[PDB]
Amino acid sequence: SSKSVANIIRKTIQREQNRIRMLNQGLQAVSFGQVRGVRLNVNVRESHAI
């Protein structure tokens, strides 16, 4: 059960990262003042990865 829980957490994290990366493509090259692009950076915290 613990192994399954870990695997499902990993799978959900991967899916959400993929979805956010997909969404990010639409905000490429937005010209606002000196701002030229916007990104939602998603990462896995080490304190929780371990």
Residues lying near another protein in the complex (CB under 8 A):
3-4, 7
Cβ distance to another protein smaller for residue 9 or 38 = 9
Shortest reach from residue 16's CB to another protein, in Å: 17
Shortest reach from residue 29's CB to another protein, in Å: 29
Shortest reach from residue 49's CB to another protein, in Å: 16
Q: What token pair was written down for 41?
A: 């950076």
Q: Which residue has the tokens 């000196």?
A: 34
User: With contact defined as beta carbons under 8 Å apart, do 42 and 16 qualify?
Assistant: yes
